Amino acid sequence: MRYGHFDDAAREYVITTPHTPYPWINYLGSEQFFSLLSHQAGGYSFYRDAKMRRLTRYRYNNIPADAGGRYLYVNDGGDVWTPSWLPVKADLDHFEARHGLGYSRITGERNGLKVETLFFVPLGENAEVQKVTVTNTSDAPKTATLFSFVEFCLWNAQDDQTNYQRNLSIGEVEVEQDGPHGSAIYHKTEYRERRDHYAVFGVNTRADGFDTDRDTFVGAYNSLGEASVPRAGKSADSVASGWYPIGSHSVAVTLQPGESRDLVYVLGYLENPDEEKWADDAHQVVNKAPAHALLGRFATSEQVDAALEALNSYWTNLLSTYSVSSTDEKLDRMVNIWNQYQCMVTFNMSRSASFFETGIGRGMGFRDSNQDLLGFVHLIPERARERIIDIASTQFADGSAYHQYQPLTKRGNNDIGSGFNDDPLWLIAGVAAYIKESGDWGILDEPVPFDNEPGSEVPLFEHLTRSFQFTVQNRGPHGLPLIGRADWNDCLNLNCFSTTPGESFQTTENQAGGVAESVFIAAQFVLYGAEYATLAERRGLADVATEARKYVDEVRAAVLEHGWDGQWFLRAYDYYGNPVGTDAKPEGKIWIEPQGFAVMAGIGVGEGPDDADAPAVKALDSVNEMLGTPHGLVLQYPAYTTYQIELGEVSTYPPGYKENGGIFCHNNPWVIIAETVVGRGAQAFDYYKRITPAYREDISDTHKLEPYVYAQMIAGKEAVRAGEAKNSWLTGTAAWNFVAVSQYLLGVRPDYDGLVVDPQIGPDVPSYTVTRVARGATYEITVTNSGAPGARASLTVDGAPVDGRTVPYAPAGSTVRVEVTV
Amino acid sequence: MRYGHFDDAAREYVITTPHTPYPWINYLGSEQFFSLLSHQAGGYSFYRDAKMRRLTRYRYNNIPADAGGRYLYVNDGGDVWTPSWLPVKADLDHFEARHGLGYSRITGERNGLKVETLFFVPLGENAEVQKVTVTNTSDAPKTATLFSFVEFCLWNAQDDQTNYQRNLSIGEVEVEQDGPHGSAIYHKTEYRERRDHYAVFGVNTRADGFDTDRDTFVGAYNSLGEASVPRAGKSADSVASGWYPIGSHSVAVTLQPGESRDLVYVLGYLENPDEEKWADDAHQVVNKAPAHALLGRFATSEQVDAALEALNSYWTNLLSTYSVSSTDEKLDRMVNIWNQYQCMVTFNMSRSASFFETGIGRGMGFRDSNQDLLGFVHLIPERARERIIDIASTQFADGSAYHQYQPLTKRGNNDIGSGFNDDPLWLIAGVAAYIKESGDWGILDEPVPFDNEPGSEVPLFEHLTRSFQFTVQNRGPHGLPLIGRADWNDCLNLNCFSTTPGESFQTTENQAGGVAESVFIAAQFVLYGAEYATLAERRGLADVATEARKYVDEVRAAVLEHGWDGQWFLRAYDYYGNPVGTDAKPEGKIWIEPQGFAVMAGIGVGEGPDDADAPAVKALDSVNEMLGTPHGLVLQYPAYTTYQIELGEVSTYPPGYKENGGIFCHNNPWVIIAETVVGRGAQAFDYYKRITPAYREDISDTHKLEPYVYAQMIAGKEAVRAGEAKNSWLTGTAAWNFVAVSQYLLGVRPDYDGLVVDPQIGPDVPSYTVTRVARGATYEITVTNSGAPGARASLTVDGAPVDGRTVPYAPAGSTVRVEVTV
């Protein structure tokens, strides 16, 4: 069934009940300030780093889930309820939650009083703004008192959750009931010492009362749903001293029949130069100048609407680079709105903070952020360019690099492991995608240091040679690249052999020696190594280029000679040179990663989709038969049923979940693309629909998570929970699926010198038009698609047929019309 | 204002209401398995290590506090309530929680049904047993269904709370409704991989139903107080697959008026040898042999009662070594029961897990465990001996040592800092105390490695020499010991100068250079260096001893020459060589640590308590005047009002809390002892009463925490929360206060060759008798105390007068009657 519906004209998902299978959230902000907001006002906000600068507290695995956030307690004649339903759970006459692009609206109505709240992070602002509209829907005048509520976090989320022996005595706040634009509360924990920042929580009106101490506001023995203050109907004007600081204002409202009133609340992040931190000589009063300015910028509903309009224009402009109009509205919906929206989120968040990733140990992964670029370069190329520079700056002189870096400092760390041999090549993938998109070859000349070291700068292209050379010089006995800690699959640890519980397979020291090789890195090298070669040729390096393509040829040969099992590609060779992912073994006979990536690299591709002799065709057929399910393709089959000490973390998961038999959505688009390469568009489009949000909305009670964004994994067959997803939002499957549908299914993909139009989506989408802005020109691509198996397009440009499927880039400001016949 | 009372005869603290100022807990277990149990059944259990082997989940800073633990939902004709009050909070006709030694009883009654639960960890068992007795107190037959409940933790507490991206898919259980002694549930997360252990939760009867999935038991949108299963009146027989495993059984009972029924539940920790892990050849079913045996040892109420009586005898024996009988029942209560009970707990827990310390970052402290030995050696000398060995094994060859070690592996780590220069000398303190107590000189010969390195073994005594030499070879320009990271005071970081927010002062690396010196370590060195000299002389090391005594004299000379501010002792010299803790500064004029420790070391002691010219008297007079409050002695005065970059973490706390103006109870006993040294017993006893539990019970509403145990800190005079405590249970305050009252106030203390009897407690305790078992002999010490200042005792033994106050140890098996006159 469903718990809501898409509203395409408004670019929102409408949740019609608070009783969803799981908390469904939205991300506010797209610059440096972010907020996680559930359809029940749950979540938290942070500035740049969810671990080091978290403004508000949020409890993971709470009972019940998501029982804390931005609340507005309404007391109407003694009756207390919250429009977000939770935490009070009063019966509401009406309830609706709309998640839009960069903003959300939550509305609850009870006994003649409707309360709607608009949540969003304004462009250029480090704050979350709430515009509350309370309306009297009865035929008689009403009065009520509204109590706002937000629980602060002590900035360092990790410290906040574990170091009470210290932090229960450091909570500090300041109260300003009579500010220039209304009342405001200041959370200044540790501002006394090393912090040059504080948070503010204010409203555009002089509040009747306030509260900053949670225990006083909530009351002993009470949950947020039984908060004492709202029930009493009067603030306690508590001034916190240690323990748990909060922000709360009481506002008395009076409304004639049909009359409404707006209230604007602001949660802001402020900083002061060290030499202007205090308002007094005694250094006891925080300088509120920046806070006042901010509150002044959102003192009226007109300012809020103006900012919301700018955010709308912002998104209209971002989404104008790639769009499609076809016969499939679920497809259009994904392509024009949601997939691109999610790509903005993953670009900004990586895999750090969601309702699954706790925003503590994970920052910006090297592999993750490079891949996120693939689906983000068309949105804001300049930010992609800077990201590439930041990512490459955490690379080592020998080619390898830190697996991730801390958001706040942009410095690498080993917190979640090191020495993953697939990491280096991803840098080449991200740069190539960026050059193809923007044509900014100058980026290759950008000076980039190694591990942020002063004096170690070399041109970015040199960094790429280091990455390319790292693989060529780290191949094993079969000519395949050594896997190291692991490859794309973090759970394939062939140099681990751990028997000690508790220690993460991710950071437990690997064993020296062995000949563990990866077939995945082999295909990855064949694919991106070829791009490296092209980048070198363009720079005039015939020497470097020529050698590079030789190595690519050697590894390609190695894959066919030593990485072929008979009906599908081998996965790897373990520490002892034993094959992994072979039909000879009882479990884990076939692994999906190499099948998709090898064919993407053109390995084993025959003369056509019906060439049942080509290994690429055999591999894909095997994938379909052994890994296919109604919810997507599982990682490997059969799943491991006992701990395989030589394979690492993989077999530690019960069958059907995560890397052991689960549908790891991220690698499904690789098979999708592989199928388009071989010329089987119908099957590729089929796989796309099995895991895409819009197509799975009708089974929301099974998927359970958000119906408008991709998740990391869906329980595979073999799991009692088959079809149920976990880890929504933060996943590379967003970037890879946008790549798949926009560039290979719909077929519009940027190349170095032109735009290739190579549709391969099958018969289910007979006609569509893609509007693509590229290199400053607008391309109107009109496709008439027969869907014929293996049939590829022929183009006519501006009234004249052309050869091939690559349209040379037209000059900026131009508008070219290409007619496509497939 | 009280919420209960002491029951001396039963050795319990009786809590008469569930509405306490804060959750009040008891610790179950004294060997390898421990349980934190609040008066509302809240808390959790773990095996040896709270971070690595935590059986059950507990949420710190939950709303409301302590909502989660061992619950028993009672469904009486549709009405659902819990005897522990929380989480349902149904009105109870009667409620009472009794915390005893190693066990607790919680009783709740509602509408004709009384439910009593006995909680405890049996000796020699790694489990928590619950004996539940249900009684029909009405005049008509009753039928009710009891639902047990406990939420499992995924072993690694840190992973459990932060790695959901993985662990929401690994939870695994096994259900055994028809076991040999009743029904049982097995929590076996990760047993399929590296863990050789699992937990069991069973009941001594065949249950009507069960539940292993939290969400199914509790229900969507519900808190534990609104659990659906109990409300429905029957188990859902849920079998978990990932998410949140729980243990729950349902038992229907029918009781005639006045009839009662017993049910015995068991939460156990089981291990299996690798070759005995599975019941099947396919390795899918856990071998339950050890679990079946455990459940068999507690299948009857008779077995429970026998184990409880064994526990009672165990404590009677432990408390028979030192006890007193005076005219003060609060004093007696503390000395005979509670202070000693707490010392066993600190010995076992160090500072790792309480309702404040989270059982994650902290293991067994080097400084902490050495000091706890001071109040534990008389209880179980054999276990203190091993602890000394384990501690010394984490020491480095140069004398320095790991600041703490992981409880499960006994290996040190730098998780909470490194290079604390006071650490080394504490090892000598612990060993000296142990030898004086047991006369086990052989321990100095025990082979002991450095940093657990096999083959690096060296006599324990040699480790002491390393500690001694470390201080000798690390003195500054004034001849005082270099402070390093920090001394006893973790917040006096003079080599820090941090301006980077969020990074712990404890772990942030420090700056080389400077001349920062510590007066505290100087005093510490004089005190324990003297002990080292004695041990060296007794070992036959005449020259080493002579040398040692020489170094000791130099350090004490430096204290009086470079560590005296005029009216009190200086605290230290900063990185720049400037004095810390001087009247020349506006804040932090006088610090308490050096005042108490220097005098304890005898530095500055004059002709008597009336000698106003003796520095020791001036110092203590300054302490009384500037640091004294009705709740104890504050750490320093005035507290710092702005961040002092050269002092480290200390000034980061708001005035009046923790190390910045708070009453850090741990250092109060040093001033208490100092006072008995200068001959002012009345003042010393006064200070003892200010911070002692039994004396603060009458103001439970202000202390707020447990009224039967010491806390780490009580808010100081500069705090708005003055008088309010934080961090109860785990503190060196327990061991040090026991040392103070048992050895210096009451005056009975062990020496190398005899038992010292030197009372110095003032006129408030005119007569008392101490029964002390030492070196296998019993000493009945009858004291007639005038309490006159400066007055020291004269003794008579078995009818004859003796010289001085030291009674040479009598042969084992004898009873010595000492008559003391003061």
Ligand SMILES: OC[C@H]1O[C@@H](O)[C@H](O)[C@@H](O)[C@@H]1O
């Ligand atoms: O790491 C433990 C230390 O942490 C510091 O922040 C606290 O102020 C000390 O009281 C404590 O001993």
Ligand SMILES: OC[C@H]1O[C@@H](O)[C@H](O)[C@@H](O)[C@@H]1O
């Ligand atoms: O640390 C991150 C990694 O943790 C592993 O436990 C998971 O199986 C991986 O999916 C994840 O990438």
